[PDB]
Ligand binder design. Structure first.
Ligand SMILES: Nc1ncnc2c1ncn2[C@@H]1O[C@H](COP(=O)(O)OP(=O)(O)O)[C@@H](O)[C@H]1O
Ligand SMILES: Nc1ncnc2c1ncn2[C@@H]1O[C@H](COP(=O)(O)OP(=O)(O)O)[C@@H](O)[C@H]1O
Ligand SMILES: Cc1cn([C@H]2C[C@H](O)[C@@H](COP(=O)(O)O)O2)c(=O)[nH]c1=O
Ligand SMILES: Cc1cn([C@H]2C[C@H](O)[C@@H](COP(=O)(O)O)O2)c(=O)[nH]c1=O
Ligand code: NA
Ligand code: NA
Ligand code: NA
Ligand code: NA
Ligand code: NA
Ligand code: NA
Lengths: 211, 211
């Protein structure tokens, strides 16, 4: 009752290759939720505004160079420093719609940096687990013509090919919903809405990666 | 031969409670090695001068506050960004004498922050393993009168008591050498020298935590 510590909002993550449409789709979903009287906050990773995120942003823009393990652990620490906020929102009944999470961490590091997958998962163990992940599936060559593509470190077609394969580490999980993202914006969004309307709305216990 | 990738220097770590004499002893050992014609570099963790180390230094000085997991992972990332340097030194035949390493990470986080020990070890898995660790053993109340004690976050006797117990996670390992550090500087140093002279001097393969 008073000490109720149940998760009341839902936590939805978008995952996908670079420029696959995650910001596009997460903003449309947020607007749809607001229109159906659901309180919701839009979050994303990496958050480049924190001290850790600033270092990350320099890495992505090739303004610095860092060893594979060092940058992998910063991407994870950047999520941890948001756990208090995500937990509080969800306890309040506010939904969280989030562009990228720990699945990006594992897929990008194991595919682009060739880090060991179990080693990559470890530091994200214990993060709050989302209700669903929409994976905006595009082939590795598909998005190379969209606006700023090639500006940041992983945006080369040969790297995207590797990350496309390591995203399959999650492809058969029950929380993972493959979405064909080589379609019109509105078609993709309608599929996402269809899936979101099946989410069961009741307060429940928090769960944690990698359960 | 030409592609020889053998570890040629030795890697010695000092561990110990706050103000237990690690900088004192590591400088004396460095001077002793130089006097016996051994090339050596003195390193220490956290390195507060990097981008990551700056954030760490603010945490230790209570200039910011951070969640337990976030700061734990930064302490680990701070070691990783030194692996290229430590590896190169050791390949060259330069010894590395280092004030604190991954054992501090595990002992401080599991003792002061109550983090799960296996979770704390994971991100340091894969770091280069030292030849020996001297643990400058002092009781948890012992150092409270030494110069700047109480300036930084963990320097309260009740926290030191907890970290004293979690340093025992390594107490029975073959690389771990307990040194009674409640003695005169010169007596402690003579014990360390005695142990250092038993190290076998030949080139060998690198080993890695937590083997
Ligand atoms: N399905 C789509 N069809 C055409 N253009 C799209 C589609 N989805 C997104 N875009 C455009 O592609 C670019 C990248 O989209 P964005 O949502 O920013 O990708 P991400 O967040 O995955 O990097 C933007 O210019 C966006 O307007
Ligand atoms: N064995 C000792 N006896 C008396 N004073 C010592 C001894 N070892 C170190 N000190 C003094 O204690 C303080 C902390 O020593 P330091 O080597 O800086 O500790 P740490 O590096 O472990 O924090 C310094 O003022 C140092 O001169
Ligand atoms: C969240 C996360 C993102 N990334 C990559 C995915 C993108 O290439 C870049 C983030 O940029 P974005 O989401 O604008 O594309 O960071 C990681 O490598 N590890 C992570 O943990
Ligand atoms: C290297 C390391 C140090 N620490 C603590 C030990 C000290 O209290 C502080 C470092 O300060 P120092 O070595 O001057 O004392 O950081 C950690 O908590 N985790 C680590 O991984
Ligand atoms: Na990108
Ligand atoms: Na985005
Ligand atoms: Na699925
Ligand atoms: Na200290
Ligand atoms: Na020191
Ligand atoms: Na021993």
């Amino acid at each position: 009752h008073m000490t109720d510590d149940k998760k009341k909002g839902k936590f939805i993550v978008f995952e996908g290759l670079d420029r696959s449409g995650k910001s596009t789709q997460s903003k449309l979903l947020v607007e749809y939720l607001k229109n159906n009287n659901v309180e919701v906050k839009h979050l994303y990773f990496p958050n480049r505004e924190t001290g850790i995120g600033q270092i990350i942003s320099k890495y992505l823009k090739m303004e610095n160079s860092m060893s594979n393990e060092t940058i992998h652990l910063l991407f994870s620490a950047n999520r941890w420093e948001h756990m208090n906020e995500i937990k509080s929102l969800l306890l309040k009944g506010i939904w969280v719609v989030c562009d990228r999470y720990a699945y990006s961490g594992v897929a990008y590091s194991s595919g682009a940096l060739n880090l060991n997958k179990t080693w990559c998962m470890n530091p994200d163990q214990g993060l709050i687990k989302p209700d669903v992940v929409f994976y905006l599936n595009v082939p590795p060559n598909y998005a190379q013509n969209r606006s700023d593509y090639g500006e940041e470190i992983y945006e080369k077609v040969e790297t995207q090919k590797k990350i496309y394969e390591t995203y399959k580490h999650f492809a058969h999980e029950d929380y993972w919903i493959n979405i064909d993202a080589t379609r019109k914006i509105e078609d993709i969004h309608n599929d996402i809405v269809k899936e979101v309307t099946k989410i069961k709305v009741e307060p429940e216990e928090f769960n944690f990666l990698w359960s």
